[PDB]
Amino acid sequence: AASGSALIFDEEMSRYKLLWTDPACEIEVPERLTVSYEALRTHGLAQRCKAVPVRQATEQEILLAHSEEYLEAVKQTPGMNVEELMAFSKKYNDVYFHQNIYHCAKLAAGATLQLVDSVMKREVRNGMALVRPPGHHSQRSAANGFCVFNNVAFAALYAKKNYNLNRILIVDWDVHHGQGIQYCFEEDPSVLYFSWHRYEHQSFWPNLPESDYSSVGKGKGSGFNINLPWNKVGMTNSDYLAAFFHVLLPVAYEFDPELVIVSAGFDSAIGDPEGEMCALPEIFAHLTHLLMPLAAGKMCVVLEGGYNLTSLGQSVCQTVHSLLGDPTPRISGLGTACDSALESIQNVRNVQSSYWSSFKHLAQSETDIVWPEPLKRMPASVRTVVVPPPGVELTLPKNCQHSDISESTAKEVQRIRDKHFHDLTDQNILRSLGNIISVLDRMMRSDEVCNGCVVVSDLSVSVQCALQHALTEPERVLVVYVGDGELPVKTNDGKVFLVQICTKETEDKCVNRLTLCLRGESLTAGFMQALLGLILPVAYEFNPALVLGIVEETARLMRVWGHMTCLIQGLARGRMLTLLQGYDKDLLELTVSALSGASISPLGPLRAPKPEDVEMMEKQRQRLQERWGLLRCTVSESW
Ligand SMILES: COCC(O)(O)CCCCCNCCCN
Ligand SMILES: [K+]
Ligand SMILES: [K+]
Numbered sequence: 001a002a003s004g005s006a007l008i009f010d011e012e013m014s015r016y017k018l019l020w021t022d023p024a025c026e027i028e029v030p031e032r033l034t035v036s037y038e039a040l041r042t043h044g045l046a047q048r049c050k051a052v053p054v055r056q057a058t059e060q061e062i063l064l065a066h067s068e069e070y071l072e073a074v075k076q077t078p079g080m081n082v083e084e085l086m087a088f089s090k091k092y093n094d095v096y097f098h099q100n101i102y103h104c105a106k107l108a109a110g111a112t113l114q115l116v117d118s119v120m121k122r123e124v125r126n127g128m129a130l131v132r133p134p135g136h137h138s139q140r141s142a143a144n145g146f147c148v149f150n151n152v153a154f155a156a157l158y159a160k161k162n163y164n165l166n167r168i169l170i171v172d173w174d175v176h177h178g179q180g181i182q183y184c185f186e187e188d189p190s191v192l193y194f195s196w197h198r199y200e201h202q203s204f205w206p207n208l209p210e211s212d213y214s215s216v217g218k219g220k221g222s223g224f225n226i227n228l229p230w231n232k233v234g235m236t237n238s239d240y241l242a243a244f245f246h247v248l249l250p251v252a253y254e255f256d257p258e259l260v261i262v263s264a265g266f267d268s269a270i271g272d273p274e275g276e277m278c279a280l281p282e283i284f285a286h287l288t289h290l291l292m293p294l295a296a297g298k299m300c301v302v303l304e305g306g307y308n309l310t311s312l313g314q315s316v317c318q319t320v321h322s323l324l325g326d327p328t329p330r331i332s333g334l335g336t337a338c339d340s341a342l343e344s345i346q347n348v349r350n351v352q353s354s355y356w357s358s359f360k361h362l363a364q365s366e367t368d369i370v371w372p373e374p375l376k377r378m379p380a381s382v383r384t385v386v387v388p389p390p391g392v393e394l395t396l397p398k399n400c401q402h403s404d405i406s407e408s409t410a411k412e413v414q415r416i417r418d419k420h421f422h423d424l425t426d427q428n429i430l431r432s433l434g435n436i437i438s439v440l441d442r443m444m445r446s447d448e449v450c451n452g453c454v455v456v457s458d459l460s461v462s463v464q465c466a467l468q469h470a471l472t473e474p475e476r477v478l479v480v481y482v483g484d485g486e487l488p489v490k491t492n493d494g495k496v497f498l499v500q501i502c503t504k505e506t507e508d509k510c511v512n513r514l515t516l517c518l519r520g521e522s523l524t525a526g527f528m529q530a531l532l533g534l535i536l537p538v539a540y541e542f543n544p545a546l547v548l549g550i551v552e553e554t555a556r557l558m559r560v561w562g563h564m565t566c567l568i569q570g571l572a573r574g575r576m577l578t579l580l581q582g583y584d585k586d587l588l589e590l591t592v593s594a595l596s597g598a599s600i601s602p603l604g605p606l607r608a609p610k611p612e613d614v615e616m617m618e619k620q621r622q623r624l625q626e627r628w629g630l631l632r633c634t635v636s637e638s639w
């Protein structure tokens with residue numbers, strides 16, 4: 001029922017600045033807030049967001065994560081002169097105070113709570129708060145790293161008290177380790193904290209031993225703190241996506257959070273002087289997209305770091321673009337993560353193996369810098385086209401339409417019939433192939449339609465016309481097929497990759513085919529492991545121009561189909577055609593709901609998969625990780 005996205009911002013939070021010479025602090029400028037909001041207005045996305053006003057966090061709310069002594073000390077900063085502000089800033093590590101910073105800190109804290117309230121009251125589906133100062137370094141009785149009050153820690157504690165939440169996921173993709181959040185929920189199993197950060201073997205700020213992968217929590221909360229250290233600079237998009245596919249996402253979907261809060265620091269992007277990483281701003285459009293199936297889309301993005309004004313504006317827009325449901329941009333050049341990233345990923349999975357069932361099999365035997373500008377993201381005129389069987393009226397979302405076949409398309413279906421299948425008069429089939437071409441032409445060519453779903457009766461003839469027609473308009477087509485037969489699909493030229501979900505196991509020889517024969521109780525948990533750990537890594541590296549989904553009528557376990565078509569829309573700018581053999585009102589409504597960008601129901605309590613399933617999946621990884629390096633979650637054995 002939730003509708004749009006909130007953007008909480010106020011110019012007042014940019015009215016404090018550093019007043020003395022401090023080489024460690026001069027990068028935290030008010031222009032980070034000005035450039036970020038001005039970039040959203042330039043791209044027209046600010047106007048597309050509901051501008052929820054900011055408020056001050058009350059004293060009672062600040063004490064949720066801070067002590068009375070620390071709050072009382074900061075409360076007297078508005079009355080201090082410059083010399084007194086210098087002496088107060090020296091008591092903490094890499095932070096400066098201003099006459100207006102206590103005011104702005106309460107606004108940054110209150111703005112975060114306004115976003116949490118808007119999301120939890122179903123007034124919006126998600127949102128972002130462009131706040132300042134940041135927070136994830138702030139501790140109970142100390143300011144730290146430009147942070148006065150821990151904004152994200154407030155949001156989690158605030159959502160727990162006023163909404164009785166049991167599970168909250170915090171994703172910290174800032175380039176620094178948010179040790180203030182880790183200290184706050186160190187013993188709390190209700191708040192799962194994930195953070196990657198530039199570590200360089202503790203040589204990078206804040207130089208903390210507990211910032212390493214070994215800190216998994218304490219007491220009842222052990223296993224709910226996940227640190228992923230970067231021990232070398234220059235981490236690429238492949239490193240960031242390997243962290244998501246092989247660490248964060250398997251844990252997040254098993255956790256099943258009721259609310260997702262993001263410590264969105266963009267100093268992990270290309271060109272930032274503090275992060276020195278090499279990920280392009282478009283990667284944040286996917287980091288946001290891969291998390292939105294969680295918690296029915298209830299996602300609160302809180303601005304943290306980001307100090308390259310050009311890179312910051314681009315990364316903010318890519319985040320809001322995905323939150324508004326705009327199609328995700330294509331990511332090319334993906335491959336294996338570097339050895340340092342694979343070592344970090346390998347170590348985190350090993351330590352966490354005793355806590356999460358996605359890693360449980362790893363525990364015993366028999367297991368001036370310049371970059372190109374991002375392209376223009378644009379939502380289609382109508383996102384989804386639905387073609388039900390002849391004479392079936394349906395209730396469609398406001399951004400959907402039905403199929404009329406023009407005479408230009410009607411002549412093509414004939415030419416296809418007089419050449420191939422020249423003994424085909426089933427006029428019902430001829431209409432479906434006419435629909436397939438009409439929807440595909442509106443997908444690939446004109447920017448009017450994003451994706452679509454077509455109900456078919458013949459499978460071999462329909463998938464042939466769909467696949468062959470897509471390979472001639474321009475390039476690369478990924479095929480996801482849930483059935484047991486054999487389809488006229490040739491994985492010969494490297495232009496097609498086929499993912500097959502069947503019942504009987506088939507010895508696969510081509511490295512362009514991924515066959516998943518999953519055993520029937522835990523078919524939901526096993527499918528999600530294969531989706532996050534196998535299907536998504538190869539699909540992202542393959543980088544298709546169109547996704548072709550096929551479901552035969554014999555196929556049942558449909559609870560996972562909504563998550564697949566939502567996550568798989570990260571490929572091919574969301575251009576996905578789904579062919580459903582036979583009519584199923586529930587399955588058709590599920591496909592159209594997820595294709596349209598609506599939220600998906602959580603999977604609930606995710607159990608543990610069968611050992612025979614994880615064994616089959618790891619044998620597929622061994623067979624394919626040499627060709628598709630993004631599948632790797634360990635360091636390669638050198639000859
Ligand atoms: C969410 O806050 C944004 C941030 O994480 O980027 C803040 C950390 C800056 C602290 C680093 N000081 C420079 C090192 C010189 N000793
Ligand atoms: K982080
Ligand atoms: K925790």
Ligand SMILES: [Zn+2]
Nearest residue numbers: 174175176305
């Ligand atoms: Zn940072």
